[PDB]
Structure formats: structure tokens, C-alpha cells
Symmetry: D2
Subunit: 365 residues, 4 copies
């Protein structure tokens, strides 16, 4: 009566203790290159039982969903990018900037593939994102000590076949290639404490995923909208709309083929618009070849991985979100940085003393 | 009975004809550097009765709201940036890539301010952004004509006092400085067909906005959360919370003084968390010194400016947004372009012919 | 550019003219006798191209949706009830009082079935409803003309096999029995201009629906949650979950059998929780036997029925709904209506003339 | 990191153990006679540290919000009605029928006022409500035990001044007249453990509320839209728009004056449409005379009453709500009780054996 309701049928972010032998995966974006309030672009939050937390992809729009988990910014410092599509990493800037004012005190750590040359790789990309936002950076840095505005980039060969790219505190990430637009993109396997979660990213059907994702607890893979849907919605000629499901993208039928090969405890289809008139065709495509546990992902779906089961719930999270304070500590600023104001601009100040008099007076007692 | 409901109490994007002597302004972001599903970072869509349209600021998260307006990518090629904060242009990338895969045939045109030196200006910011996303650009330009993957930058002097920065088809944008983090930030005024709309951007109270926003049909200005609210939501020390409303940002009372001076037909307050326990005190603050027509901005608020009236209303728009096709032509992909695939990645294609045979044959008829 | 978007991918209620050979059906509730913000209890609004409009069912909570369609109360006076579940006609009371404050000028017309005896029928039910709300009726009628507060009831015989219960202006409703908890429940067929819409109400699988619903433009039918689901969600013993889907309700597999028999242009399944982890099994259940066009119903779904197609879309409507005014002229109150105030209560009034002095001067010019 | 985020900024229903010296109050409706997904008609949940729970009003729409709180049906048995408006008790039926099917064990208890004669009181109201829903009552009593279908009514004298109408377990409700549409409406005071909560219900300014609601921890009173907002929305003439805020309802200005008198810890305004262009004018009305803590209510607003603070939050709760089981027992049917089917109806059962055998088999194994 006055007690707490156990095993809730929805995930309320911040309301639940994580078990030492438990993973929590939250889809903070499941969408497309088209922006949509119901679906941010691809983003995954992993919370391990040992207190380690990772983001895999941080697409355009995902930061709103990520900020809604009531997780302090200092705990969301490690970011893996499958690839360098705006719809895979475009909110990294919002996580760099917003997280910093939210009181991150550590640099961002970013693991992402190379390309076929320096300027098609993750290091080039991050380096120039930081030059793009130089004004934000210098103006911020005069006051706030600049350490957390660092991004340490760990680039790995996109070509490598299931090679470790991260080994720390009992946690392994391995990568392997995808086939998606051009050379560069990868899939991630996260291994910890008996478990294995697989982040496909984006790819046409490839020989590497079905091999290295085998027997995962949670397998995530591109599952595209049908050729019929492509023709109804984007008004594509049948030949173009066919090509999209065979050459550019993993079809639902293809997705089911791969998860039949993988044999996960739980499969996840993402990277399609989950509407009242698309999802059923795509579910049917999958079920042609795969009959095991299947999630049809949308924004703020959550997976609990225990020894017993893989549980799918929806997260009920605050739309009117706020930064939530962490156990970190005020770092000691930098009184050796050059101010970015001229006196021509500071001579613009408006005398507002008389309008602010009444509230300024009550406020100081 | 069978008839369209005229002068509807909410705005349905795509449902109304825009009159030739009418302007329509929609707030696609009203929020803060903290992400929130309820409020994107700053973005304004402006629609003139002569068919000209404009985005003023395109902050982190605004793209979902902009795509909810059912406006073809080709009609939204022109972007004005008040300043180079993540939360004022972080989504220029989503508009670039998105509008390109959605059928934008023309390059993006971008106006923003210079800084005190090259690497503090818009020219440098956008140049290094295109480099940041070079993997996206080069891959996409293989399959899709590259001309609309261009961004033509129009850098204007941030120091200029109320000087034109755009003039085209009887439309003028003027700029004047803001006082905000460091040199470069501006406010804009759009002058067309007897009308004046002011976009304040981000600023502590300054002597220029009161002078140059005078007699505006719609006046927009930063209006910050109360010091008491700074000390409650974030747990600041009194001093730091006082300084924020007296030095770093415009207080409600300040906003009130400025709009008192400006005597706009209609004034808009934005850039605070519009919540059921914040908005009222901020409202009371404005009303200390300003008694005129006022909107307290939140996401998808819209203003109709006619000779007779300045109407405020809410837009009711699809969360499940799709791109909408515009009048323009198919453009031809440049075939003198090297693949970004090596044979090593392409040798990974999976045989999926069988799994896909069922739907495949049915679709070719 | 300044024009309307044609054939929009979502329905904006109030924004689209109905053709003279066109029907529009909006699901205003698709849920259970359990309350849910995301699904109201059963309710349908039918709009014919000839100007006539009808509600079939008005279950608990449906009114907030019906009010969102921006339809004047004076156009929504004709209500047919499939049966007498709270979850089938619970919001009749809200349509009765709400419509009347908001300027309905004609009486409500209700068609509902008889039962096995007097006190199991719509006549008894509505006579005693009006008694329950006698305080509301008498207090409202001092001030507003009592005529719109009349309910004319049209009790049809629940036993009749596919017999006319309404025939006016080229429109026909037939009824036939359901098997649902107790004698009384019916399904209806609306016939107009060569269109046939079937409102299944609630039923266990019966021999009448497949016969009388055959060749429907749009066929609607109960489609219950699976026996696995009933156990998972509600904590059921194995053999009671089995009984729900074979005796009490129409299983998804049965729904497929019926719609296989009916061969409609479009079948609609409804009266199940449409959730991210219920919908897909239900859909696969139907698909075992029925292959034709299907909608899995949710709240605010809309079908456009033309000669050429049956289109499913989602309605996008104001959560902040208001009454909308219809042309219908003024209606003169009574001065043969006793006040319901005694002077004991009326002597309780508070002097507030001075607290209201400021805005009461300002307002009288 | 693996911890639970404490003293959280949103209330997640089901997630917070209630303190023994604490009251929790949720607005489950705040609306008008007009239906709206944003605002249910008036409803209030009170939870007490002794584990007693209470509903005060249960207006049309409210049940969807009540069910979102994840409270078992069996702990929600006691309803107090301020008055007999459809928008104050229209969803009692929904709590009656819906609780019962979800394992409520005890009858509902209902406390409402009498009127000037039997047919204007709560005993008469509820008696005829049960007759109205006789079919539903009689059919449900065949397959589930009939006792939780009962509604034990406690009618009290509306005219009484501050008299005890409930007295159990250290909890005490008092009532006093309102002036609302006609004789019969009241306000409640809930007194428990040195806390006073006051439920305004609906009234024009009266001499009883200020007297009897003095020293209230939480104090709730009608507060109406402005005359200007009445003229603009409902196309009123000038004089009738004036009569509404002086005679029939309590103005913002009068809400101020009355709350100035009562000097509660925390004042609540409700019964106005809480919209981005209405609420502000209403805030400013109330602050002409009241400067104490003030909530402008909307659906799912919650107050925590502790010794130290009256804390406002917003509840973030599932739209896709479900019943949660309580510790109550599995109560048993009745064979005595006569079936409500005739052989005429059962003779209509369709044979669906072949359709259902495949799922029927796998369920039993
Ligand atoms: Zn991609
Ligand atoms: Zn800024
Ligand atoms: Zn029923
Ligand atoms: Zn009332």
C-alpha cells in the first residue's frame, strides 16, 4: 500500500538498481537519416552490472532520449561509433558540449573505425568537428578549465576480423567490417561476465556478422523497410526500390536469415520507421526465416539481460528532462587563457539596475 | 458538414495557404544547451507570403520539428546562424545530409557572423564541419549528384551596427552585436513588405537590441530562468546564481525593460525550460516592466503576422514525420566518381537469394 | 511553396473536405474495459460524403478523441450502441452534458438493442442514466433550453437477423446478434452509395457476422489478446486463459477465419492492447488464415473509403481540444423553470467586488 | 553508478515508498465539461502514510490517469463526490465495472451530498446509475462473484457547516456548502496526523471555504478562465462573459482573495484549460491578492505533503497502462446465479476448431 510496486511492467529510468550479474540496453534512437520526433537516429546505452556504461552510436536527436535516463554526464564518457554517417554520430557534439556544462570532468573517449585513407577515418572526423566548434570551445574554455572539452580518439583498422579494440575492467569490444555506402563502417561485440551483446550498426548482409555474433545474448541488426513501402512513401521506381533491399540494405527476410544463423537469446531489428502501417510487413519478412525471440525496436525500448531471461520493456522517461548531478568535484579553472571579448562589445551592456532592483533585493536574505 | 474548418484554433503544417501579405513564424526549438524531448535547442522557421522561407538558428534537436512541417527540402536551403554554439547550429549537419538524401537539388546557403579572427567565424566553422563529415560526403556523392552537398557560406562582420547582411527579392536581414560568451554573436531583423521580425539570438541585455528592434511586428529575445530556480534545479551557490541573471544572460525583468523600450506589436520570450513550475515566475518577471502582447515560447508555437493581427497558436504536427516531395527535377549522379569500396569489403556480401526469393518474385510483378 | 500540401500522409481533423462518393471512419477508442491514455474504450465516428455523420459506440474515455476531430456538437446527434458495457456506451453521458453546454440545439438520438426482458435493454438503460444525472439535468436546464438535453431512444429487437433499424437519406443500418456475456449485443452494417461498413461490436465467433458482413468495404471485429498474453500480463491459470480465446472472445486465429469468410476490401482488428510486445503475435494469429488487407486498430486511426481504395492513416489532432462552433442558430431558454437555489445557500456569497475592481473596470471598455 | 537515483525531479508512480508522516496528492483530472486528452474532468487521488487511499471526484476521462498510478483496484474503494456534475463523477461507472473485472474484492464505498429533494441527491444518483448499467451488472455477475459489484452509498446533508461525514483509522472528512449550479455541491476537508487537505470541488466565492479551510497544508479551489478568454474562445457577448467570472464561477482575482484569507502552506488553482496562451493571464489574476505558494494544476501533477515542505512535481506515468495485482484473494463465482444467454443466441456459435487447433496444441504442451 505505502510500499514500492515490484517488477514494474515499464522501466522508469533512475528507479532501478543494477544487479552485479545484469546488463541494461536502452535504444535512445532506432530511426533513419530523416528526423522524426518518435525516432532519433541510432543510439544505444549499455549499463553493465560492474558500473561501466557505454554509448554505441550517438545519432542526430538521440541526446534528448539519453538525457532522459537521469544518468550523470561523468558516467557517459565512453562512446563507440559504428560509422561516420550524421545519423550515427551527429549528436556527439551535443554530448561533448551539453555534457561539459552538465559537469563532465573527464575527457570523452571515442573508439571508431579508420577509412580507406586519413580523411575517411574517425580521428580526422573528431579533430575537424572540434575545429568546426572552435568558437564554442574557446569561449567556454576561458572560464571552465578545458580538460573535459578534450576528446581522446582511439582509431582501429576497419578491416580487422573480430579483433579486440577495448579491453578494460573485465569488458571486451571486438569489431569486424560492415558493407554500407563505402569502406569504413564496423559492427561491435561487447563481452563481459558470461554475456555478449552485438551492435550491428549499418550493413548490407555480410559473411562476418553471422560468424562473430554467434550465440549472443542480444543481437542488433539493420532491418530495412520493404521495397513496397519504399515505392508507397518515397515514390521510388520499382527497380530502384528493389535494389535498396538487395544491395544497399539488409531486408527483413535477410535479417531473419542472419538471426537463424546467429541463434541469439534475443534478436533486435532496428533502423526502420516503426509506424502503425510499416511494422507488420517487416515483422512478417523476419518470421519467414527466424522464429526465436525478436524485438521490433523503437525509441526507449529497454532490454534487461540476466542469467534467467532477456526481458523487453518500454521506458517511461521525462520529456521535460534535466541534467542530474554526479559524485564528481569542481576542477580548478585556467587563469592563463585569453578572454574572447573586445571592449567594443562589452561597451554594449544595457543599464538594467532599476528593472532588476526589486528581485535583487529580496534574493540576498 | 463536408466542409474544411476555417481559421482553425491550432496550426496543421501543410494545411493552410500563406497569404501574399502574411508572415508565418514557427519555433522549432526554444530550449537550452541541455537536450529535452519537450524543447529542442534554438530554431525558427520563417515563411513569407512571396514564397521565400528561412531558418534562423538550427540547434541540436530542431531537425525533428522542422521535418514535422511537411515542407520540401528544396524550399529550406537558406540558414541564418545568430552564433556558433552547438545549441544554435548543431543540427545544420542533419539538414545538410537529410535534405540531400531527401532530394534537395540546390546547395545550402548559410549566413553567420565572423569572429575577432578567422578561426572564430562562420566561414571557418562550416568549412571544418564539412571536413568532420567527409566520410558521409564522399560516400553519398558516389550514388547522388554532389552539387546540393555544397554549403555556400556568407560571412558578414559581427561588429556592424544594424547593417544589411542579405537583400534579395524585397527581403532584408540586418545584424547587430550580442553580448554572449565572446565576440561574434548577433541578433537579426528581417524587413519585408512593411513587416519587421527580430531574432535576438543569445545575449546579456545590450544597448543595440532596444534601438534596432523598435516597432517590430514580432520581437524575439533570450529570457532566462530565475536565480531562485538556478539554486533549486542545479544547486548553485547564491552568488553564481545571481551573476547568471545579471551578467551572463537576460533576466525576465531585463526582458521586460527591453520590450518596454521596443514597443513591438508582439514580444516573444524564449530560451528557458518551459515547465509547470518554472514558467509563471519568469512570466511575472517580464510583467514587472512590460504590459504588451507576450508569448512564452515553447516548441511548435506559431505566429501569424497580417496587417490586422499578430496571432499566437500551437502547431499540431506528426511525431511520425516523413519527407514530403517538392516541385523540382531528378538530378543526374556524376559517373566520373571513384567508388569508396575496395574489393576486400565487397567480397563479404552474403548469399541471401533463397530467404529473399519468396517476396522477390511477387514484387517483380 | 505558399500552397497547401495535397493528399497528406496524416489526417488533420478539420483540414480535409469529404468527397460525395467518400466515407471517413475514425477509431476514437480501440481498447479494453481497463482505462488507458493511449487507448480509449470502443468508439467510431463515420462521416459520409452526403453530409450525414454517426457514432457507433461511445465507450469510457472516447469523448476526448471525438472532441479532437473539430466537429460541431450539432453534427454528432445520432449514436448507435452495439451493447451496454460501460466500455461500449460509458461516454454517452459526457456526449450528453458536454454537447449541450457547447451548443448542441437538437436532442440526442440513440439506437441500441433490447435484451431478454425490459431491464436488459437500451430503453431501460438510457431512461435510468438520465435519472442518475438528474442533478446535472435540472441545474443545467434553469440556464440552457432543455430540448438539446432530451435523448430520443430507438430500441431495436436484438434477435433480428440482418433487419433495417435505420433508413433515412440513402443510409441504412442493419443489426444481427453477437454472442457476448449475455443476450443483447449486436453488430451493425452501414450501407450507403454502394459502400458497406461493418461495426462488429463485441462477440465470440458467431454464424451471423460471416454471412451478413460479406463483401464489406471495411469490416471491423473484436480480436482478443493471445492465451500466452492473458497468462503473462494478468497472472491467469493455464485453462482459464484457454477459455478466454475459445468461449468468451474471438481469438486472432478465429478473426482470420471470419475475415477469410467475409473477403472485405479492408479488415480492422480492435479490442486488444496495441503495445510493442502484444501486437505482433495477434497479427501472426490473424495471418494464419486471413491474407487480405488488414489494419491493427489503435486510437485516432482513420480509413478513407473511395471507389479506388481503402487508405489507413493516423489522425494528428489537438490534445488541448476545444468545442468548435457550428452554423446552427440561437435557441430561446424557458421562464417556466424553477431555480434549484434555496436562499440559505445563496446567502453564502462572498464580497469580492474590490478584488475584481481592477479587471472589472478595464473589461467594460 | 549501479545505484537508484534518489529525491527524483519527476514522480514515477509505483516507484516511491510513502512515508508514515506523508500525504501524496495526484491531480488525475483538472479539466472542464469539455473532453480533452490533455485534461480529464476533475479527479484527485490521496495516499496517506497509514496506507489509507481515497478518491475525491472521478470526472469523465479521469480513470486513464488513475490506472496510470499502478495502484491495485482493492486499495481504491472509497470515493468522495463534491457534486453530481458529469465532470465530477461520470467515471464512477468505469471504476465500478473496471475494478471488478480486475479483482477488486469489496464493494465501492461512495460519500456524496443530498439535494433539496430525493431526486437531486447522491443516494438517488447511484441507485439509478446501477439500473442504468443493469445489463453490464447482470452479465458480469454470472461469471464473477456479485459482491464487488455493489455500491454502498453514504449520503450526507449538503447544508451542514463543517460537520464530520467520515471518521475511520484517525482520518476525518468534514463538508460544507458550495454555491454551484444549484443546491447540493460541497467542499471536503481531509484531516489526518496534523495535516489538513482541502478539496474545493466547484463553487462561486462563498463565506464557508475561508472559515473552514484555514491552516490547510494543501488547499484546492475552482479558478476559472478570464472573461476575455471566454469572449475569444466561445464567441460570447461582453456582458455574459462578465456574468461568468462574478456570479457562476470564482475569478482568478477571487481565488487570490480567498487564498489570501485561508493562508495555506500551498494553494492549488484548477478547473481552467491549462494552455500556452491562457494560464498566464490566470496566474496574474491570482497574484493581485495571493503571494503564497501556488500550483497551476494540470493532469498528473502531484503534491508531497511532509512536515518540512509541500513539494509540487509532475508524475511521468505509462500511457499504455495495465492493472497491477494486489495482495487480495481469488474470490469465487456463483452457480445459484442464472446464465443471461438464451439458447437462441448460443445456437449461433460458429465452429472455429480447425483455425485454432495449431495454437491450441502448442499452448497445452
Ligand atoms: Zn549509416
Ligand atoms: Zn548561445
Ligand atoms: Zn463488451
Ligand atoms: Zn461542476
Amino acid at each position: 500500500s505505502t510500499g514500492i510496486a515490484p517488477k514494474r511492467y515499464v522501466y522508469y529510468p533512475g528507479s532501478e538498481e543494477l544487479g552485479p550479474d545484469e546488463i541494461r540496453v536502452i535504444a535512445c534512437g532506432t530511426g533513419m537519416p530523416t528526423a522524426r520526433r518518435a525516432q532519433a537516429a541510432a543510439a544505444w546505452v549499455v549499463e553493465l552490472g560492474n558500473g561501466d556504461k557505454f554509448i554505441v552510436d550517438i545519432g542526430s536527436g538521440s541526446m534528448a532520449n539519453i538525457q532522459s535516463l537521469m544518468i550523470p554526464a561523468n558516467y557517459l564518457t565512453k562512446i563507440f561509433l559504428t560509422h561516420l554517417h550524421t545519423d550515427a554520430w551527429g549528436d556527439l557534439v551535443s554530448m561533448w558540449a551539453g555534457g561539459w556544462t552538465a559537469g563532465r570532468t573527464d575527457p570523452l573517449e571515442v573508439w571508431g573505425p579508420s577509412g580507406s585513407r586519413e580523411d575517411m577515418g574517425t580521428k580526422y572526423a573528431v579533430e575537424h568537428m572540434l575545429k568546426a566548434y572552435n568558437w564554442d570551445y574557446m569561449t567556454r574554455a576561458v572560464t571552465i578549465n578545458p580538460r573535459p572539452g578534450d576528446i581522446n580518439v582511439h582509431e582501429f583498422d576497419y578491416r580487422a576480423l573480430n579483433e579486440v579494440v577495448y579491453q578494460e575492467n573485465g569488458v571486451t569490444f571486438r569489431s569486424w567490417p560492415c558493407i554500407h555506402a563505402g569502406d569504413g563502417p564496423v559492427s561491435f561485440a561487447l563481452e563481459w561476465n558470461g554475456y555478449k551483446v552485438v551492435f550491428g550498426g549499418d550493413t548490407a548482409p555480410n559473411i562476418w556478422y553471422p560468424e562473430y555474433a554467434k550465440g549472443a545474448d542480444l543481437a542488433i541488426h539493420e532491418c530495412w523497410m520493404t521495397s513496397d513501402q519504399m515505392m508507397t512513401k518515397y515514390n521510388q521506381p520499382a527497380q530502384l526500390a528493389l535494389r535498396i533491399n538487395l544491395d544497399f540494405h539488409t531486408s527483413a527476410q535477410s535479417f531473419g536469415q542472419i538471426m537463424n544463423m546467429v541463434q541469439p537469446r534475443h534478436a533486435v531489428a532496428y533502423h526502420f520507421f516503426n509506424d502503425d502501417d510499416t511494422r507488420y510487413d517487416i515483422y512478417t519478412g523476419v518470421r519467414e526465416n527466424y522464429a526465436g525471440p525478436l524485438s521490433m525496436a523503437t525509441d526507449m525500448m529497454v532490454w534487461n539481460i540476466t542469467r534467467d531471461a532477456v526481458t523487453e520493456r518500454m521506458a517511461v522517461s521525462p520529456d521535460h528532462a534535466w541534467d542530474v548531478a554526479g559524485p564528481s568535484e569542481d576542477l580548478a579553472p585556467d587563469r592563463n587563457r585569453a578572454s574572447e571579448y573586445t571592449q567594443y562589445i562589452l561597451d554594449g551592456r544595457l543599464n538594467v539596475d532599476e528593472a532588476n532592483a526589486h528581485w535583487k533585493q529580496e534574493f540576498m536574505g
